[PDB]
Amino acid sequence: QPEPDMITIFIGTWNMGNAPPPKKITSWFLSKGQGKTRDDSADYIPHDIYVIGTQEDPLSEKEWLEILKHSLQEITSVTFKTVAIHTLWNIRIVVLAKPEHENRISHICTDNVKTGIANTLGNKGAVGVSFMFNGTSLGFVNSHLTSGSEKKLRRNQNYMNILRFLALGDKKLSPFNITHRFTHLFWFGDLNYRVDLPTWEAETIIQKIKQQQYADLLSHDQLLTERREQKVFLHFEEEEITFAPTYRFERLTRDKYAYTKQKATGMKYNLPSWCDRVLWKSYPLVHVVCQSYGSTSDIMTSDHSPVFATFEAGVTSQFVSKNGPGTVDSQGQIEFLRCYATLKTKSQTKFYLEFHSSCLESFVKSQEGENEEGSEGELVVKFGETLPKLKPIISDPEYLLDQHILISIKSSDSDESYGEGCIALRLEATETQLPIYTPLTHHGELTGHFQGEIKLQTSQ
Numbered sequence: 001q002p003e004p005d006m007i008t009i010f011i012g013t014w015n016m017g018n019a020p021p022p023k024k025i026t027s028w029f030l031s032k033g034q035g036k037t038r039d040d041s042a043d044y045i046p047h048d049i050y051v052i053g054t055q056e057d058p059l060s061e062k063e064w065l066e067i068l069k070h071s072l073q074e075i076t077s078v079t080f081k082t083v084a085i086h087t088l089w090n091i092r093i094v095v096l097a098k099p100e101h102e103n104r105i106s107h108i109c110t111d112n113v114k115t116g117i118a119n120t121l122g123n124k125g126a127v128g129v130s131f132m133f134n135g136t137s138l139g140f141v142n143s144h145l146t147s148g149s150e151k152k153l154r155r156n157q158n159y160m161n162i163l164r165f166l167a168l169g170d171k172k173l174s175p176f177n178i179t180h181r182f183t184h185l186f187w188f189g190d191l192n193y194r195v196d197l198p199t200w201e202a203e204t205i206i207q208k209i210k211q212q213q214y215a216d217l218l219s220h221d222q223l224l225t226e227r228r229e230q231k232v233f234l235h236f237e238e239e240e241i242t243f244a245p246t247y248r249f250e251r252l253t254r255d256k257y258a259y260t261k262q263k264a265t266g267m268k269y270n271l272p273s274w275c276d277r278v279l280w281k282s283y284p285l286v287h288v289v290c291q292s293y294g295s296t297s298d299i300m301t302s303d304h305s306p307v308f309a310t311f312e313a314g315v316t317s318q319f320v321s322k323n324g325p326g327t328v329d330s331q332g333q334i335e336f337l338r339c340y341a342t343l344k345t346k347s348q349t350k351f352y353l354e355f356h357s358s359c360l361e362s363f364v365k366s367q368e369g370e371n372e373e374g375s376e377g378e379l380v381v382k383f384g385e386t387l388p389k390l391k392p393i394i395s396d397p398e399y400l401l402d403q404h405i406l407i408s409i410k411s412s413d414s415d416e417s418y419g420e421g422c423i424a425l426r427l428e429a430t431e432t433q434l435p436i437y438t439p440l441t442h443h444g445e446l447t448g449h450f451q452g453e454i455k456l457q458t459s460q
């Protein structure tokens with residue numbers, strides 16, 4: 001029975017509005033409704049992994065797991081295994097997988113982050129799950145961010161707190177936050193970003209939605225504009241939105257948007273918005289293809305519609321050789337030539353690098369670089385040909401070309417990371433000097449760049 005090199009992943013996000021679901025929710029898992037929908041010919045094909053994020057979820061874990069498992073068994077005739085379930089308040093994440101994957105899944109982690117302080121601490125935040133699927137690390141975040149059209153900067157702050165403090169994946173990757181710990185990271189939820197148009201334009205917006213003309217609405221979507229201005233979700237992807245706004249509906253129909261201010265809303269308007277989203281970030285040159293992104297039309301118990309997204313995701317096998325794991329493969333090496341970091345910092349400490357990868361027995365510390373002043377004010381840290389030769393555990397090119405090197409640049413004075421990035425070993429050539437590049441981030445914000453050349457020696 002061969003190990004897969006691709007799997008499909010279902011991501012669902014649904015703000016349930018504190019109401020129990022209707023009896024049938026299969027359209028959600030089938031990716032049927034509005035937007036980029038799944039072909040009918042695939043309906044009986046199970047996804048490998050189903051990740052379900054809810055917000056305002058009124059159910060117990062047991063109650064929701066029974067509904068989800070029943071739903072999937074009715075669609076696929078497969079009894080899914082529960083990988084993980086984690087709840088913070090009324091924010092929940094469930095991960096289900098086909099039974100054949102039970103012995104491919106390991107290192108399961110869960111965590112939550114509570115956002116805000118005092119007044120603003122007690123219902124918003126995030127839950128997450130991570131695990132290994134054979135040689136591939138997968139992370140999943142379900143966040144419920146701050147509500148309200150005039151709180152976009154609070155949402156951006158909520159995002160940065162969640163990616164700083166959510167403790168998932170390999171704790172040995174100590175310089176790295178969740179935006180660097182996984183081959184594939186999916187981040188979804190009621191992100192609560194709104195269409196920023198005047199209140200007076202509510203009926204005009206509704207008109208546009210009825211005509212399926214989303215362009216003049218999407219150009220005002222706060223998440224798209226904040227992402228274009230590099231305020232949030234830097235280096236994440238989102239499929240094009242081709243479904244109507246998923247909030248705020250009158251319950252028990254989808255015929256009406258309920259936008260007007262009420263005591264129940266704190267006298268706030270809720271103009272139709274794409275609150276409910278799925279984004280992802282995968283390591284460079286790993287296969288990831290969105291195959292659906294849409295909303296259901298037939299699940300109407302909440303003031304939000306459920307959102308679905310599905311992905312093809314490249315995965316690798318748990319590689320064994322005669323040598324590694326448990327020794328090096330002297331036939332393998334990674335060399336960095338002519339490397340330098342450009343940093344936005346005003347500080348003047350010496351810096352060193354750390355190289356982290358599951359292709360190394362443990363992380364590698366460089367010598368300090370040589371600081372120069374850049375033309376336009378910047379700090380340039382030169383490593384030249386000084387970087388330590390990296391010794392992978394396995395030299396087979398079928399393994400090594402699929403790996404990645406995480407890089408942290410750290411202050412000699414504080415040992416704190418000033419920037420983190422990732423280099424793919426999926427090179428055009430081996431035994432050949434080739435350009436490499438990553439942006440560097442810290443707390444998910446841009447802090448610099450790392451560029452140079454690589455020379456990769458494999459057993460071939």
Ligand SMILES: O=C(NCCc1ccncc1)c1ccccc1F
Nearest residue numbers: 026043044045073074075076077078
């Ligand atoms: O017909 C259904 N599921 C049978 C699954 C099946 C699997 C493999 N080969 C043939 C058929 C069904 C689908 C959606 C909703 C409700 C249903 F009852």
